[PDB]
Amino acid sequence: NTSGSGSCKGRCFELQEVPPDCRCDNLCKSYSSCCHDFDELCLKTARGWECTKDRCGEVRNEENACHCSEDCLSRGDCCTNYQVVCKGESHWVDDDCEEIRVPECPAGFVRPPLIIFSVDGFRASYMKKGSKVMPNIEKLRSCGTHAPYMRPVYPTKTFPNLYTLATGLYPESHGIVGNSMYDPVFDATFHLRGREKFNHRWWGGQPLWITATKQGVRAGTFFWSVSIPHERRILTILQWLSLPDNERPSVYAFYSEQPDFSGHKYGPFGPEMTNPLREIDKTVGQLMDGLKQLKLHRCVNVIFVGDHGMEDVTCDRTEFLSNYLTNVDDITLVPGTLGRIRPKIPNNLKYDPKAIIANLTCKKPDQHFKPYMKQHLPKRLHYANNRRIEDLHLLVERRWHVARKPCFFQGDHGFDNKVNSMQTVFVGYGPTFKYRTKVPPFENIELYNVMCDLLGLKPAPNNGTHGSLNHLLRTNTFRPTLPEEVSRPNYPGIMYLQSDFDLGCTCTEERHLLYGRPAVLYRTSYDILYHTDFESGYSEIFLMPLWTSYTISKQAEVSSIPEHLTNCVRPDVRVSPGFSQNCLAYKNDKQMSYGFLFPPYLSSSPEAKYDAFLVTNMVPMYPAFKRVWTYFQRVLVKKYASERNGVNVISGPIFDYNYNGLRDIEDEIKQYVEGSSIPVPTHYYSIITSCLDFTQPADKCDGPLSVSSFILPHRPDNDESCNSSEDESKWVEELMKMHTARVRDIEHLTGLDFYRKTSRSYSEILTLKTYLHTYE
Template sequence: MGLGKQSQKKTIIIGVLAVSIVTIVLGLGLGLGLKKDSCPPGPVVPHTSCRNRCYEPYDGDVPGCRCDANCEETNSCCFDFNDTCTLPSEQWECTRLRCGEKRLEKSNCHCSDDCLSAGDCCTNYKHVCHGERQWVEDECEDLSAPACPASFKRQPLLLVSLDGLRAEYLQKWSRVIPVLDRLKTCGTSTPYMQAAFPSKTFPNHYTIVTGLYPESNGLIDNVMYDPVFDASFSLSSPEKDNPDWYLGQPIWHTAQYQGLKSGTFFWPGSDVNVNGSFPNIYQPYDGKVPFEERVFTVLKWLQLPDNERPDFYTLYLEEPDKSGHSYGPDSGGLVQSIQGVDKIVGQLMNGLKQIGLHRCVNIIILADHGMEETSCQRKEVMQDLVGDINKYWVTEGPFGRIRARNKDTVIDPPGLVANMTCKKPDQKIKPYLKADLPKRLHFANSRRIEDVNVLVDLKWLFERSPGSLTFCAGGTHGYDNDAASMHAMFLSYGPKFHYKTEIEPFSNIELYNLMCDLLEISPTDNNGTHGSMNHLLRVPFHEPTFPPEQSSPDNCPLESLNPPAVSLGCSCPGMHENVTNSRLNLTAEEVSAAEKQHLLFGRPRVLQPDQAYCVLHQEGYITGYSHTALMPLWSSFTIDQPTNLDPLPPVMPDCLRADVRVPSSKTPTCDQYESAGNLTHAFLYPPNLNSTADEQFDALLLSNVVPMYPEFKKIWDYFHRSLLKKYASIYNGVNVVTGPVFDYNYDGRYDSPEQIQQFVSGTNISIPTHYFVVLTSCKDSVLPASACTGELQTVCFLLPHRASNMESCKSSQPEAQWVEDHMWFHQSRVRDVEWVTGLDFYQDSSRPIPELLKMKTRPTAAIQRQQ
């Protein structure tokens, strides 16, 4: 019993102790816990950066700098608040600080880790954040194998305009424009592209996208008046948005009509409802939109889904034109502006590389015109020349146009031109009736072109009255488009263009056809010559062919050696008629020899319908004689390099005879010219080029005669007498084709019989408006024209046939003082001659047609006068 009680007692003691221990432990734990809760917190690390904290709500319990929207008011922002939070909404590039940033809603572009998948990275994201090289740092690539995403059905075309970037800038400032210089090196470029006249912004931009000269595309200037609309157009007026001003079919419509899409980030006409529609995507013009935003937007368009993505794009930048106007073409401000656009083009190329399209997109970067220095001290004043100017409205500047001040005022355009011509020594302006302007300008065939136009010397300006032209210092454009300072830059790059290639200059009217070829669509009718730009392309899309002849020659056989029974009033003392006429009866071998010598590149084809003519062969020349016009359509002959430059001897006097191969009903009479009053006859082929009297007789024929004003004949005779041998010497022999031109409606195309307005008095013999000359020689001047197997070169003239030579202020002096200058001012392209005559040359030259078209369209600025 005693032991049991002791054991029970021990158990109770152990239980009490256990409970006590548990109680103590619980008490200590609870006590310690409460004590811990009552302790003050440890030190908190203060904020020192806005990295991933931009615009977080302000928390006053957190020490350090702030990143909320109001931190600037209290001057408590973190040091990097501006760089990290503010600048992304103002700038368009990544910095090292921004790499891996938290995406910000207001950023222009992003540098976050997800920006590539979102397609909205800044264009230098991979370069700055991943160490990849910029596009300009890469080696030139031969893009013979395009690398486009599988979803791209065709290679996109991007057309970029850098307004007013004179061609010369690319060479002069190449060291400070590395991106443009790289594109020039790696792609296809030209020393310059000739702008259309007038060398102004809207006319040339619209020419580029329509292939039409300003006289045909409707935009003859940045400022103009339409007498039918009785309205004026300017870049700041509501009329700018009136589609009735815009003619032709811009390429974005050509693309849309053939199932393609277009996106335009500014281009003259692209935000106007032309032809009843807009591009698929377009931006209404707003010059305040940053250049970077324009590039970024185009890059976004390139990443659209297949059913939304455009095939053709435009991008327009106002610089360096604005700086050129403000500071002049040779200024620090101008250099800064071209550095700025070079940076923008660099962003474009980096962006294309970043989205994997730099080996896919075909890019054309160009300008609309150049820039020339001006000064307020160099102005010609209309009022100083003509006195009273109250009835005139004058468009001032580098090119002038004059009309009546209002519809009720009548002015005398020919009288005004005469009153402004050669009024003082060293005059800096020259007035013209629009029909008399050089054909190379293609500036007449529009009701919006005033009757009186004023060409202005480079660096000078034309104003109505003293001080009326207020913007005169700095730079401007609009001068003669042959001037080097008006030339525009052109670069192209992409898989369809040649690699590291420089081509010869060309005119911007050829670009529309080229761009259609790049898009693989068919162009609508335009002023360009399709196929003339094939040499830019690795694989040409269009293969041109010769136009078919519309009127084939008839035969003009010599049926009798006797002159016609009907008297033609001709006489030629000292000539043995039968003997001389027998020289016109060439054998087949003699005909072949004459053609081999004088039709070096084939007989000109006649594209005029219903033209009755025959080909007359002589030993010294060959003529296409028109039974319809009663005069030669053309005359062709070849002059070898002469041994001396002595002028040709005088033409045998008092001799003009009938051509026994031509029926008397199809020839003029000699006395018709004798009674023509202010007209005389002249020879298309110079008889005095022949060395013997017999050979001269071969050319003293009515079939070699054309009507001429005596004053113009001074020009023609000097050309025959002195310049033909000079050019044959310079070019190592030349083939010469000459003939009359009829363009009374001054549209640059040959007239129909109904359109011809003036005739030799008392006859149905038409008076030409111009005479043409086409000189062809070998581009390799080591080879004579008669043995040329390579490329050809040409010099052409379209000489206005007028009763007065007052256009030249030196016309009272000997012809050697002024005729050649006058002729070169009226220089033209082969294509201009073909259009205005209805002839087509070189069809038998055995040369590739694209090569011939390149030669025919070679701009006049690229054909320099040689002494």
């Protein structure tokens, strides 16, 4: 027919591409193009997967799944336990750890092979079960390189996280934004069940196997048809490692759907969680026993990685949109541990997203979801820049579900990736990995760079920070390089006259720039301005500081903005009026007010406070945002300075009007103060750095640093905070925790490079820039 039927004799699980002729590969069943003898020749199950005493030295029966004869080592098809049963050897788990300082690979191996062992729904807390349940896995964790947990990407669903690992891209970037999704361009829907998921048009970016392929590294067939058992896949990977030098792949992948399947049906803390965990460990033991049989246990690099965790979710904790909305039949909702709303039909003139958002906003005192326009989602989630992401998004609180209209499950996932239950596992074992080393938790977007390094691959452009995980590897082939500055700063003097201004208003480096001047990595003209208490880089294009740096010691006296100085704004004689803002625009804008990047409340002396009221320290701020900002400046900064023995703060604006996580150009800026060229930031950031050894002051730190950061949305109302009518001590801190950010996120949104002049390696700094303070 279209395929036909030849013989799979000597072709079982071939890697060669073969369609005119009949196939014998891992996915031949999936296309119904196998040969008549494929099942009988390749999918053998007779007598199981383990050797026994009776089978030692047996006469070779080809019917058996694996063999226990003397020849099986030469012919390459013993069972994984042949040597321990029939030759008195030991399981790999029973052997003590021995540090693999150099790869002990057979001749013909140019590089250590990489085997990626991925598991679905593996909570990091499962490793607390330890050697009791998973001895093989614990040995990999103990004698290898391991993190306490690895942060997944949002949403914490299976395929978005699996592909993020393969690409190093955020789901908005590689295109798999959920297990269920609708692409308006395709007019088609992607689902966990169906053929549309196999269409490659959905899968963007460059996955690892393509990156290896385009650079001459042989990738084994990673993906298996469902009907092939796990044990057969393990024996096949071992057989591939025994292939001749001109065919042996360098990178291998094993994926297991457990313990995710059981976790959904039993709950993450269920007593029969143990059985799937043991079964996974037994599969790992078969791999390690087999690698030891092939003398590859001290040659291969093994990665044990998960995609997400699992949380207690039952139908008794389900929110229904029908208790909020009157048009549930006019909408389409992606349900579950997350919510995405869409009109059921286009041309429905009775569909208003504004009315839907309002009717979902703080309508119940314990409302277990929060509506969001995707552009207002916390920037750490990086979930806006895709046509497959609906404008209306619902962030569901942990342990809860959202449906459209009113259990067989006790567990589910998909929540905010900072939720502790969604954290998953990472283990690195092999010659290139470190021995008995614990590394701090990291995000799964960084693994693509490491896997490329472990294969000598040049990474495709991705959202990992290359070099941020060099501390995982005994041998690092990537040396990070500081980006070069593009725009150098003007250091202007006192060059203008206060009479030359038509403002319309009325009325250091050793201490405040502790980690070096941020580098402007884009072409602009900006001025570095010095003051007693703060230093800034003032942009002449955007009429405000790009960054503002100041240090607050543990011993600091808070002050109030004086009543006479409340509305004081002063011209800066170092900046021209044409490159300055004006207070008339703020008066002529009914909705926009102004704030100050360096807080006047924290001025050192009454004379120094006059600098805090300079026009060059002024930024546009909604009255709603000013409530958040003023509490942060008047209360929170000193509190942080008291807890952390002083803090250095870098604050400034962020413009991202197309919600792509990147720095806006002037053309992409779409709002300005009324009758003015002053741009309105979409967000405001701050970077709060101190000495990790808090017995040292922030301005006199010797070793590693500690950082916390946020990116607050700049919004005209506080509808995000349901308790905003109360005092700021009751809601402001909670809002800031939800919008915590890595310094790296700020760098993308500002085009600035931080921590350039410090006393640690660039690799250590890159790890600091990727840190996310979770408060969880």
